[PDB]
Amino acid sequence: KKQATENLMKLLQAYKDIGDAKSEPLLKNHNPRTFEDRDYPVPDFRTQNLKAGDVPKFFDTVISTRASAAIASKDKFWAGRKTEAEAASAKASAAFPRVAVPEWKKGKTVSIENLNTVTDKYAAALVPKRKLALPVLPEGVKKAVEDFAASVGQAKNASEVSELLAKSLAEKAVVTEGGKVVEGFSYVSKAVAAKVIATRRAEVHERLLKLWAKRLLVSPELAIVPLNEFDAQLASKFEGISPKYQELLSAVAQGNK
Amino acid sequence: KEELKVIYGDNVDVKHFQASPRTPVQQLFDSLKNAAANKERAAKEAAAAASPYLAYAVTKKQEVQADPSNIPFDEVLYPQLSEELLELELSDIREDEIALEKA
Amino acid sequence: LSNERYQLLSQWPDFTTMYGKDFYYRAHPEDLKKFYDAADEYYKLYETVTEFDSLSALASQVVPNYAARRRSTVHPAIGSTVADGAFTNFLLSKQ
Hints:
- It is classed as proton transport.
- The structure is cut from a larger assembly and holds 2 copies of chain A and 1 copy of chain C (95 residues).
- Helices cover 47% and strands 2% of the residues of chain A.
- By secondary structure, chain A is mainly α.
- In chain A, helix 1 (2-20) crosses helix 2 (55-89).
- Chain A is flat.
- Chain A starts with a helix and ends in a 5-residue tail after the last helix.
- With 95 residues, chain C is mostly helical.
- Chain C is elongated.
- Chain C has 6 helices and no strands.
- Chain C has helices at 2-9, 21-24, 29-49, 55-58, 63-69, 80-91.
- Chains A and B meet through helix 3, strand 1, helix 6, strand 2 and helix 7 of A and helix 3, helix 5, helix 6, helix 7 and helix 8 of B.
């Protein structure tokens, strides 16, 4: 089991090395969209002799075939990646650090000064390898600026005059890697990136609202075939389309008189 | 909800933080607005820990967990990952925008 | 004996140095689930080798069978080498 874990840790180092030599994105090969073929010949439902309710079941098995063939193409990537890393796993370094356990000799005891430096090694890996230097304002400088505002007489608003000094360093907080500042490191946060998504969702949803605005200004009878029951009507020929809504759509199209 | 239950209570209003997550500055100021009850909970737990090994272990864990510089930011840690997790939703929207440009 | 097994859990590679997401996403999804199972296995082995309050009841599974061999009808300290050496005296003398 120690050798299986050293084999797995050497394998996950081989995966990280030959994926950083190829410089590939992290999520690219785990995304099965990237193994999907968009230039497939896309089977036409008008040449497959479908009846009225048969077209959405045709669409589902063209999709789920093309999705299964992208998943099975992702599996063929990773099964070929595995043998590429297992070949380099066999020629690897195997110089890993050991798990910090408290030192226990054969007939001796365990000192608490060694149980505690082991616990220091567990809580020194709880810090992240690259972190924002998010500054807390100490009370040694939050009072030296509070009473400087209270010597001028802003002791009633002495709460807010400190928080702006806290936030002005918090907002341009720099990142530190190993205690040293890596400089020229711009990060896009998770509240910025969720604002890029929320505006991009609103500018595509208003194109859907503008799409259906034109189709219901010209042809307002389209609002009587519900959107889920639409391709349940289709067929391969136009005469095969289900007449559930045909005679209703023709009479709503003629107007309100 | 569970990540923010420890700060905003039980009626956390998870809709507000799903839509607009809190910035790295608001994660800081939610750390600092519970730190006095966090350093006093750890001192009340280290006093009633079963042994002086566990008493050091609940203060050393809180000495790391109460520092706001130790909050792991995935965008700071893995910058190429959080841009690619952005382009999973920007590519899902772009496929809905190509469908409306074709229409 | 638990110390000799604890000494080989001391020489276990630090798997928590590969918990980052640059090892999560570069790795095969089945070789990562094996890695997370091999890390859950070490905590199974380590939490039972440090269960030293269970050694005092394992010693009581050795005691009663030993103590019945000492309740011999011949002698407490009898063994085969002595009782074979005293068959040589018994057999290779006259009747």
